């Protein structure tokens, strides 16, 4: 029967090893496993692992995915309709018989091409893109320089042709970069992280520092917070990005204790937390998650808070 329910559709774009499973685990801390259903878009591969090898294409290739079928079932789910979704088996590399997916209050589609097809794009209510510099992405996989570099060098043509342009369509881009606080760094364990927040989505107001419309460089270490060198550095300001207006929040360095975390949170505006300290609580809820001490975990939680705010906004009427 007809319903007043508004199913909210969310997209998470990125390659593997880009913190995507970590990000989805943090979203579970905010929504739970009950009313959120997560769909790995690899299920819409048209070619299985042996098929892609014999056709000579990677999984990044659009000719190895069925966007007609993806759009059919995502649209059906958003109409409160039950679907029979195929299953891609990452172990055996095969496309297994389908399973029954029931519509939920929140549908999150995640994978390589959630923002690639305009038909699916029009269905999404909010989206992220996890952007990892080839420098940082190389450092994560290596933690053999030669063999990894070759691995990411073979995939980059497909990546820049089909994957990277999705950044222009995301409401939020989480960009991970090498640090600027350490001269000639080798390990890439300290990270400079940016939260690129697009202007345009109807109710989505960006988190900011001090003044939402202007540019600030801020070092929180001082008379009220002690840090060891090099410390923490933050930035905020308007900018343009793929021809659209954005608000960029930035953080560089590591949090070495809880006091530095709550100090930064207390000085951020419009984080959409529901109580003072919720950002720090969620960030420390899983100490083992990678990035729990720097800007990657911080901005993942912040992005989820924006999704929660977009969800509560869409389901208020």
Ligand X SMILES: O=P(O)(O)OC[C@H]1O[C@H](O)[C@H](O)[C@@H](O)[C@@H]1O
Q: Is 49 known as a binding-site position?
A: yes
Contact status: 18 vs ligand ADP (CB under 6 A):
yes
46 touches ligand X (CB under 6 A): no
Question: Rounded to the nearest whole angstrom, what is the least distance from the CB of residue 303 to ligand X in the complex?
Answer: 24
Q: What distance in Å separates the CA atoms of residue 285 and residue 283, rounded to the nearest whole number?
A: 6
Q: Does the annotation place 308 within a ligand binding site?
A: no
Q: Is 276 helix (H, G, I), strand (E, B) or coil?
A: coil
Q: Does 141 bind ligand X (CB under 6 A)?
A: no
The SS3 assignment for 211 reads coil
Alpha-carbon gap, residue 164 to 67, rounded angstroms: 18
Contact 226, 236 (CB under 8 A): no
- Site residues for ligand ADP, window 129-148 (CB under 6 A)? 140
Indicate the DSSP class of residue 222.
Answer: B
Q: Per the annotation, does 192 bind a ligand?
A: no
**Cβ atoms of 203 and 310 closer than 8 Å:** yes
Q: With contacts defined by CB under 6 A, how many residues of the chain interact with ligand X? A: 7
Sign of CA dihedral 146, 176, 108, 246: negative
Q: Does residue number 151 form part of the binding site for ligand ADP (CB under 6 A)?
A: no
Rounded to 5°, angle at Cα 67 from 66 and 71? 130
- Which residues inside 65-124 make contact with ligand X, applying CB under 6 A? 90, 93
Binding site for ligand X (CB under 6 A): 42, 49, 52, 58-59, 90, 93
Q: Output the known binding site.
A: 17-22, 49, 52, 59, 140-141, 155, 296
Q: Output the known binding site for ADP.
A: 17-22, 140-141, 296
Binding site for ligand ADP (CB under 6 A): 16-22, 140, 290-291, 296
């Amino acid at each position: 029967m007809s319903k007043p329910d508004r199913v909210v559709l969310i997209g998470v774009a990125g390659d593997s090893g880009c913190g995507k499973s970590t990000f989805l685990n943090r979203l579970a801390d905010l929504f739970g496993t009950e009313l959120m259903t997560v769909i790995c878009l690899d299920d819409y591969h048209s070619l299985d692992r042996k098929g892609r090898k014999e056709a000579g294409v990677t999984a990044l290739d659009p000719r190895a995915n069925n966007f007609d079928l993806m759009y059919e079932q995502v649209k059906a789910l958003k109409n409160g309709e039950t679907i029979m979704k195929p299953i891609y088996n990452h172990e055996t590399g095969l496309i297994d018989p389908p399973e029954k997916i029931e519509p939920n209050r929140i549908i999150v589609i995640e994978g390589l091409h959630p923002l690639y097809d305009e038909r699916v794009r029009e269905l999404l209510d909010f989206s992220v893109y996890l952007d990892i510099d080839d420098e940082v992405k190389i450092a994560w996989k290596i933690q053999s320089y030669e063999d990894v570099l070759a691995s990411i060098e073979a995939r980059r043509p497909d990546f820049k042709a089909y994957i990277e342009p999705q950044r222009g369509h995301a409401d939020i881009v989480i960009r991970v970069m090498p640090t600027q606080l350490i001269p000639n760094d080798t390990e890439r364990k300290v990270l400079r992280v940016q939260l690129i927040q697009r202007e345009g989505r109807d109710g989505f107001e960006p988190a900011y520092l001090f003044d939402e419309g202007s540019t600030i460089q801020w070092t929180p270490c001082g008379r009220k917070l002690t840090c060891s060198y090099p410390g923490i550095r933050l930035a905020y300001g308007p900018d343009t990005y793929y021809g659209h207006e954005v608000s960029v929040l930035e953080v560089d360095g590591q949090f070495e204790n809880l006091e530095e975390m709550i100090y930064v949170e207390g000085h951020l505006s419009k984080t959409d937390t529901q109580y003072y300290g919720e950002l720090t609580h969620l960030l420390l809820q899983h100490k083992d998650y990678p990035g729990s001490n720097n800007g990657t975990g911080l901005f993942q939680v912040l992005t989820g808070l924006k999704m929660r705010a977009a969800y509560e906004r869409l389901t208020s009427q």
